[PDB]
Scaffold this active site. Structure first.
Site, PDB file in Angstrom:
ATOM      1  N   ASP E   8      -1.230  -1.421   4.531  1.00 34.93           N
ATOM      2  CA  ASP E   8      -1.216  -0.225   5.364  1.00 34.93           C
ATOM      3  C   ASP E   8      -2.463  -0.322   6.264  1.00 34.93           C
ATOM      4  O   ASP E   8      -3.222  -1.293   6.183  1.00 34.93           O
ATOM      5  CB  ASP E   8      -1.282   1.034   4.490  1.00 34.93           C
ATOM      6  CG  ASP E   8      -0.588   2.231   5.129  1.00 34.93           C
ATOM      7  OD1 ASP E   8      -0.189   2.113   6.309  1.00 34.93           O
ATOM      8  OD2 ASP E   8      -0.437   3.290   4.472  1.00 34.93           O
ATOM      9  N   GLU E  10      -4.588   2.899   7.537  1.00 37.38           N
ATOM     10  CA  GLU E  10      -5.599   3.940   7.378  1.00 37.38           C
ATOM     11  C   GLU E  10      -6.728   3.598   6.429  1.00 37.38           C
ATOM     12  O   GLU E  10      -7.860   4.027   6.637  1.00 37.38           O
ATOM     13  CB  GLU E  10      -4.970   5.256   6.922  1.00 37.38           C
ATOM     14  CG  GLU E  10      -4.109   5.937   7.968  1.00 37.38           C
ATOM     15  CD  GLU E  10      -2.708   5.360   8.028  1.00 37.38           C
ATOM     16  OE1 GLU E  10      -2.413   4.444   7.228  1.00 37.38           O
ATOM     17  OE2 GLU E  10      -1.911   5.831   8.872  1.00 37.38           O
ATOM     18  N   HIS E  60       2.685  -0.260   7.871  1.00 39.20           N
ATOM     19  CA  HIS E  60       2.155   0.835   8.673  1.00 39.20           C
ATOM     20  C   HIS E  60       2.934   1.159   9.944  1.00 39.20           C
ATOM     21  O   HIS E  60       3.222   0.275  10.747  1.00 39.20           O
ATOM     22  CB  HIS E  60       0.699   0.520   9.037  1.00 39.20           C
ATOM     23  CG  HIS E  60       0.091   1.479  10.006  1.00 39.20           C
ATOM     24  ND1 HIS E  60      -0.172   2.793   9.687  1.00 39.20           N
ATOM     25  CD2 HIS E  60      -0.295   1.320  11.294  1.00 39.20           C
ATOM     26  CE1 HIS E  60      -0.697   3.403  10.734  1.00 39.20           C
ATOM     27  NE2 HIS E  60      -0.783   2.532  11.725  1.00 39.20           N
ATOM     28  N   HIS E 104      -4.436   4.645   1.513  1.00 43.13           N
ATOM     29  CA  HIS E 104      -5.172   5.882   1.709  1.00 43.13           C
ATOM     30  C   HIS E 104      -4.717   6.917   0.699  1.00 43.13           C
ATOM     31  O   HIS E 104      -3.723   6.721   0.004  1.00 43.13           O
ATOM     32  CB  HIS E 104      -4.917   6.401   3.134  1.00 43.13           C
ATOM     33  CG  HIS E 104      -3.459   6.498   3.480  1.00 43.13           C
ATOM     34  ND1 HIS E 104      -2.658   7.536   3.051  1.00 43.13           N
ATOM     35  CD2 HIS E 104      -2.652   5.661   4.174  1.00 43.13           C
ATOM     36  CE1 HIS E 104      -1.418   7.336   3.470  1.00 43.13           C
ATOM     37  NE2 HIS E 104      -1.388   6.206   4.153  1.00 43.13           N
ATOM     38  N   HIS E 115      -2.437  11.448   3.995  1.00 43.74           N
ATOM     39  CA  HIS E 115      -1.087  11.883   4.343  1.00 43.74           C
ATOM     40  C   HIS E 115      -0.122  11.086   3.493  1.00 43.74           C
ATOM     41  O   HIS E 115      -0.530  10.163   2.787  1.00 43.74           O
ATOM     42  CB  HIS E 115      -0.788  11.630   5.829  1.00 43.74           C
ATOM     43  CG  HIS E 115      -0.717  10.179   6.190  1.00 43.74           C
ATOM     44  ND1 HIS E 115      -1.839   9.390   6.326  1.00 43.74           N
ATOM     45  CD2 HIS E 115       0.345   9.362   6.382  1.00 43.74           C
ATOM     46  CE1 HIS E 115      -1.472   8.148   6.585  1.00 43.74           C
ATOM     47  NE2 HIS E 115      -0.152   8.103   6.623  1.00 43.74           N
ATOM     48  N   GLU E 133       2.265   7.770  -1.149  1.00 40.45           N
ATOM     49  CA  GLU E 133       2.814   6.456  -0.836  1.00 40.45           C
ATOM     50  C   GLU E 133       2.476   5.482  -1.955  1.00 40.45           C
ATOM     51  O   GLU E 133       3.311   4.667  -2.367  1.00 40.45           O
ATOM     52  CB  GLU E 133       2.213   5.945   0.465  1.00 40.45           C
ATOM     53  CG  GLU E 133       2.735   6.641   1.699  1.00 40.45           C
ATOM     54  CD  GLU E 133       1.910   6.308   2.932  1.00 40.45           C
ATOM     55  OE1 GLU E 133       1.536   5.130   3.104  1.00 40.45           O
ATOM     56  OE2 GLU E 133       1.645   7.218   3.734  1.00 40.45           O
TER      57      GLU E 133
HETATM   58 ZN    ZN Z   1      -0.087   4.026   7.554  1.00 39.99          ZN
HETATM   59 ZN    ZN Z   2       0.204   5.132   4.555  1.00 33.84          ZN
END
Ligand code: ZN
Ligand code: ZN
Ligand code: ZN
Ligand code: ZN
Ligand code: ZN
Ligand code: ZN
Ligand code: ZN
Ligand code: ZN
Ligand code: ZN
Ligand code: ZN
Lengths: 274, 274, 274, 274, 274
Positions: E8, E10, E60, E104, E115, E133
């Site tokens: 990912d 972030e 991502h 994240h 998020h 996630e």
């Molecule tokens: Zn992401």
């Molecule tokens: Zn993510």
């Protein structure tokens, strides 16, 4: 009798924010319509009260707001900018009196859309006395021995007018709640107010005297930041008061002081990073 | 020994105007490159002078200017905004001293790109004493009994620093000519200056004392116009000083006063028609 | 010995049109690179010829063109605008001589990108004598008794220089074919020319005298249209010559005359419908 | 008798989505026209039922939606934003009752265009009791011992109103199908409903009591994400409830709690990456 | 041994805000460069630790961030979106273990850029257990009896990982200060951390067990507003929990639950007025 009219926009009735006074914004077209009609109420009553001539000077921004095709047909309109005396262009000693319409409070004080000529000025000074557009224009009127019979705008502009001009007639078409909010009267309601106030002002004119300005007035302009002060300090005859953002200019008379204001603020308007 | 670093941009060497500090402008990318390298000179000398830790806090605008891929590898970078203590985030009583880099003069005074946090503020006050970002950050450093050993920026920021913090070491990487013009030293020349000044500051640290703030400081913020004052006056515990555009807030301590500044300026930033 | 350098862009070698000098255009980045390098040739030779100090003043547009990270490290750069004396900011009586680089022909005459400060001026006059940026800057240099040792730019700027300053050394880095076309020398070729010319200018300095300006010079500016004249005529102390678009200003000295030029042209720049 | 009116837009009749309430969208102009006329129905019936004064406060977004040139002439309009008490500006203890028009459901619940002040809030809490704009405004009305006589909007807002204020009169001008879809009554049909409901509300006023708020209310705001909570938690006197996105603020009274809401939501509005 | 990698953005080191992860923003190109290099550190150490195959799945946004021309040549890259299993596409029971990079924190909790899949979700639930996630992907990994050996990202993601997966190895490349601010390690420093952590994770793999998901998991998604819930509730087999913005879906297995998440969030993404 000749009557002079200076019409600004921020103080017009019903207008709460700049979306009504900025030519590039959504409510501008409605704004200039209301502005033109507001001026007609005063013009109509001016003639109805004996006046034989009424000179109307658009005194806002590009000064092409008042609609020539809808203004009172018997009035003479001064439209356009870059006028030698901006807001008081066309005013001489042949006028019986002056009428300020749609005025607003000076910068740094309570009042809807308060400011003085440009966003960059905090205060205008004529021999240490605090004034805004209202004050400066009254002083220029004084130079020609013409009294400011009436001043219309929000409640704060009215208060500012009467604290400067004794016995002056004021018409508060709206009440200020914040710099971008007001409690206003219906277009028709404000019309009556303006009609009555204009009538009284013209008949009570003898009780109002011209705001005589000093012989060699000292103009002082305090700007928001030092950059605007530096720009204005470029003009010959100016000086910055150390430890401040104020620039002073010793003028020969009120007329030179007014034009020095025009140039100094014009220069300050170019300031970046603000 | 742990050394804290607060790095702003306007005072960085070689930068004359906002085209170098505004992320949305043409010379920004070059600006952040020079900014990162300027910080490296101090970091390198910090370690070379004994420091075992160097915390670098990006303190400009969105605070995502310093380039993490080019900053001194042995330094710890704080990148990003919305930090509880903005410019002094990460500073506690475990630091031997603080170093302000790329600083500029406070609002309303001579100095390139002079201002205080936002364009809307004219003056910051901590118990009637005039201060800008430099002052406020020094006071927060004082709360943790951490002394401001060095302050780098233009000549005006340096002067402002030494007039507030006795024996403080200053490094004037450039000379102010106007709010958007300066006479600067070559990148390499400024580097030597910063290197020498940082070395002297760390070894002469004993002569510098923390800028201890009042127990229950009274924060006062004078804004450019009344609209910005109204916005800030929305925050609980605030009050506007009649006849001014100044808003006051009685804080419990310097830390609460700092955050009150963040919120009040944030609110003022929303002001329209200016 | 201290040497003063004023660097403009239009006259820089290799540059044919404004796509190379307008910060908002496609070839600007290449332009400022060439400009910075062009200046380095003179700076390098200045030091090589004995000079101990070389002050470089960016004199074009926003004056943030010369790249501080690529300019000769031993030179001092003045970057930024809104400087009290614009193109000659930083020049005082402590300089042995002045060097004008990248200059162009004055308005209304043959020469690539010919103009004088702003597009709106047709002619500048100092006591009835026709001058452009070159002349005005030379006169300010004269006020401080500093001689203009060398002037570099196109062939027309060189011709203009020598017709004003006796024995002045000129370096024509390019030949003018039209206002937006030139026959130029390769970057390396121009470098030699500048190197040789700078060397000769510094050693032949005794043959050049300061362009002494009148005690109370009368500044005259002829604008392209009447609107620009009206704007400038707003400044106190000015007057429009009836039947012309020329505005005059009686100054106390060359320094006041220069600043009057800055303000008057700044006002003229606001003219619309042109 | 004085009647206070707070007029929002989302609950106005006939409006299904934000293209009718967002000043920057295609159906906005029609929206504000319908909004103004909807308010006129209530105003007209208010006067017809004995009321001597009707204060109308635009309570939507920039609060410059209601058209001053088309609103009932005998009503007083509060137009503009940045008002000390936003949606309830101008409401004091001198009013016989309050009337909420065009209201919508609180955030996180069924109802067309449901939300609370800003998109970022999920729930508002006054001493653990779930409330939205309707609730908060009722509580402020309670502080002045003024009862909410009527509430108009969609069926969801009506239900929410009656579940909070006993015997309150509600007027469901439209039925909610989704957050952006409704089954509505014709403009004329809704007019009758509003006319009848307003008449009944004014005559049945004795059966409605003010929603008295706690002496020292505890304001709690649950935000959509943690970022919005961090922003609000910047305001002095706030704290984040660990393990949540809720921020609490102990207020001195309902009035301080309301303004704390304004500031905290204003700060949350700045949150990025959402 | 085959190792699976889900990368990912972030949580990548050095990245403080979305200007580094949003393909349409200024710092994106630098972001994907750092992202690709960060993945290479793990890939390199994976092979160096015995792994014979390393599948890298860009997880991502549009999943076209990792640069195929700079990724480790011996690794296999899955680039592109609309993949049947999004973030865990290509993961089957033939893999020895999984490695989550640049992760994240889940929505509604502390952590930089927190998020879950889309801005609209507040919480994901697998049989009443809170997950983001990280959790969902771990559960899908569990379905194939593949253990999550390592998880890298900010400190909050690491904490979230270890509270869910016993003995899991975590690598905190940066410390969270706010949702858009972090204290990070130099690119080279994070590289060592990742190298060491990856090595330890692969050799300590026996101590980590697959996060086995329920047989017929019940997916619950709490959205920010009711509109997003309505959109998702359009999908057959879903139901909204009265009095909430949560939508539930009874799945046949973890794989169906994952895809139901993809569709429900995709639908919620279309929600307007938020
Ligand atoms: Zn992401
Ligand atoms: Zn993510
Ligand atoms: Zn005005
Ligand atoms: Zn105006
Ligand atoms: Zn700063
Ligand atoms: Zn800054
Ligand atoms: Zn030039
Ligand atoms: Zn030029
Ligand atoms: Zn609302
Ligand atoms: Zn609304």
């Amino acid at each position: 009798m000749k009557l002079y009219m200076s019409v600004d926009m921020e103080g017009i009735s019903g207008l709460p924010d700049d979306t009504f006074v900025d030519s590039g914004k959504r409510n501008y077209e409605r704004g200039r319509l209301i502005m033109t009609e507001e001026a007609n109420y005063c013009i109509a009553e001016a003639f109805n009260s004996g006046c034989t001539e009424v000179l109307v000077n658009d005194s806002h921004s590009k000064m092409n707001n008042l609609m020539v095709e809808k203004l009172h047909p018997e009035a003479d309109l001064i439209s356009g900018d870059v006028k030698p005396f901006s807001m008081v262009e066309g005013l001489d000693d042949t006028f019986r009196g002056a009428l300020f319409l749609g005025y607003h409070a000076r910068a740094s004080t309570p009042g809807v859309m308060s400011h003085s000529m440009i966003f960059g000025v905090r205060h205008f000074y004529i021999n240490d006395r605090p004034v805004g557009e209202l004050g400066l224009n009254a002083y220029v009127a004084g130079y020609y021995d013409v009294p400011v019979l009436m001043v219309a705008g929000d409640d704060r502009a009215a208060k500012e007018a009467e604290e400067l001009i004794p016995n002056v007639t004021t018409a508060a078409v709206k009440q200020t709640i914040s710099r971008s909010a007001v409690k206003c009267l219906s277009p028709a309601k404000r019309g009556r107010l303006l009609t009555e106030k204009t009538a009284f002002a013209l008949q009570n004119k003898d009780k109002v005297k011209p705001l005589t300005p000093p012989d060699r007035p000292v103009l002082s302009i305090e700007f928001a930041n030092y950059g605007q002060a530096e720009w204005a300090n470029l003009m010959p005859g100016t000086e910055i008061k150390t430890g401040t953002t104020t620039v002073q200019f010793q003028a020969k008379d009120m007329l030179e002081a007014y034009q020095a204001m025009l140039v100094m603020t014009e220069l300050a308007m170019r300031t970046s990073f603000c």
